[PDB]
# Entry
Amino acid sequence: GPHMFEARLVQGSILKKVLEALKDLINEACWDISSSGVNLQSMDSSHVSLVQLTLRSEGFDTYRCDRNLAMGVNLTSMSKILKCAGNEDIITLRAEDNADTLALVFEAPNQEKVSDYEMKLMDLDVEQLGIPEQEYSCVVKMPSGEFARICRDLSHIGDAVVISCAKDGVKFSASGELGNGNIKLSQTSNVDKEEEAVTIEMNEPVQLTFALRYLNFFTKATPLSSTVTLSMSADVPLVVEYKIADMGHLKYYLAPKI
Amino acid sequence: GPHMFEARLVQGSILKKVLEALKDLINEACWDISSSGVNLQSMDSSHVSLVQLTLRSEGFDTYRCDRNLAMGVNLTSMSKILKCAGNEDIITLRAEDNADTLALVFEAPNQEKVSDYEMKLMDLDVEQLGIPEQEYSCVVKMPSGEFARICRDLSHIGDAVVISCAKDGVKFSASGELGNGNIKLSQTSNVDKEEEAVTIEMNEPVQLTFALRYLNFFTKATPLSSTVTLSMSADVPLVVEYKIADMGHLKYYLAPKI
Amino acid sequence: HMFEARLVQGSILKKVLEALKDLINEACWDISSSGVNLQSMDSSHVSLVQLTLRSEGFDTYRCDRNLAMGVNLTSMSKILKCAGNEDIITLRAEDNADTLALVFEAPNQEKVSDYEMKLMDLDVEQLGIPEQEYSCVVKMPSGEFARICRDLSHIGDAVVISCAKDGVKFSASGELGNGNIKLSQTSNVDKEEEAVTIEMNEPVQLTFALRYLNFFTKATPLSSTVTLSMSADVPLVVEYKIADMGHLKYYLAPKI
Amino acid sequence: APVCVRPTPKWQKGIGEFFAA
Amino acid sequence: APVCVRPTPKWQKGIGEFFAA
# Structure
């Protein structure tokens, strides 16, 4: 009879967090929903960065997608509505291939309380960019909290950060009217319970300059992942990647200086 | 000799919270003091809602009231002053009849620190309270933090809320430019601690609309009671009620729309 | 020829700047063999702040030449918000150029930040602070004193401080009414740093601007206790002991 | 209670009147 | 210790200058 899309995500907090990680970067975007999952690709309001979000359909406890949908969504609205879901709530996206509307359904962990919200969808012109394959000179996997804190600190110095990587460590440097900062992290032996490890996979050193405004947007995804990955190469966009535990990921692309 | 009113409350913080629950909606009001207890009753300046407060004398560790008297208070001034009291402080109030000042005295537990504030009063003529005790079509009792969370959440969606309750449960609904929201609460038949229970008493289904500004003010009582009770009829005002435990109650009254 | 001090409890340096930044925009740091010495009036000349950090208190202290480093306290505070609280912190200067170097180290030892802050050229300005006995000296917990200024500021803009032999009172007035706060001297060997202690050579009754006292209470994280030294016609001293290592002193004159 | 904003009182003498350079 | 939100530096190339449609 009815061509629904239905995704139940028991760990509903993932959805809340994913939208916290997008709402400041994107006003309106189009969620590509298919049998394989929820995919979102979009440049940010200013056309500076690109974000790519993948929630593989395996990662939902329940998933039904009769037909492919391209739902244009106001992210600000969707973020306010997710702010009405408790952190332990079971969340369900519901869409009837028909309708002008996405439904979000929140089951509280206590079982006598159930909220539903219905968002009015939007006609956005789907465009998707083709991401080239690339070998990276430098790949840095470090705790996410640390990357968040380095970007945060250094924004108080300058509007750019220089990232300098070697086999031994990685250096972050800024400079502004107050003066200059430099933050050095060394590669870890390997910390005793691990995701305090800094790892570098380098085939060639890099010295690249990035904008602190966009990096500090990117670190809003920090609650999603205990670690972060930076992939760098000269004159080729930076990739910032958060794994969303065995469900998919959230990637951010940003051009370095010149 | 002189006609004294004097009340000692060991859990001072009750009084503190009580004022948080009032200061933002009522500026000034008469306290009716008798041997029954402390009774307060005022309409907010926009004449839409009425708060009524009851502190029975047996709730006070010490209480004296030589004859019925009434004191005009600036709840704003009173609140500022109560923020000077410790959460553990023992609190005493003291005025004579026809006083132009109220004594508030705050005692630390160790008795090495003592503060006293002499607060200016006002002359206010306060009459009336032509409030008949009445039969409601629906009475609903639920955790106060839950009701507060609901008003908080529906206030992102719209600025009015339809309340609709039946035998099985009650539903709260809002709507605006973001979308629509419906929070549904079902009866906790079960077997539980009263601060998680949901219970409905019903003669006839009501479906009524209230502005969410006001409701959001009532919820400043939330620290006073683990529960909260809502009473509804056709176009009788809604009453929102918080039991200040072993002392009395705090009731807000709201006029529906149409 | 170079200055360098390494402080393990680097947080102290953070708290010190959080306490000065709001009162003082710029001050000169006198460096010498015996430690660090900062003195300043606030932007309106009402109060005076004096800070001593003795060189014994550092794990490492090196000072070739006496320096006077003109610092912008607000920049230096921004840069220290970037230090973690368990960070070992080092100050470093080169006498020539006017750059001060703040180096932060994680006790994990895997992360190290250096910030190079620019210095100003400032007026060398000492005021001579006189050796002195006081009629009354009140030792109390820094938090209670902080609570008291906050609460009375809801009442009026002055606090009267009445000091007897075995208690002190703090009173205010204003449009709402009066307020009075009475602390009694405590027995002690209860507790320790929640003792209230009064030494009274001469009873005082003195009026101060709550406006300024509340700037002083920003030092409250530096110490569990605060000392108040008072006489008629003589600036009040509000003193915070910093650890085993120095003090932060604030000066404010009373009415008449 | 956040701390009220209180103005400098009328009678406030400056610290300069007590200490010299 | 809260982020200082910084402006977009004048040299910032858009990602669309790198990846095509």
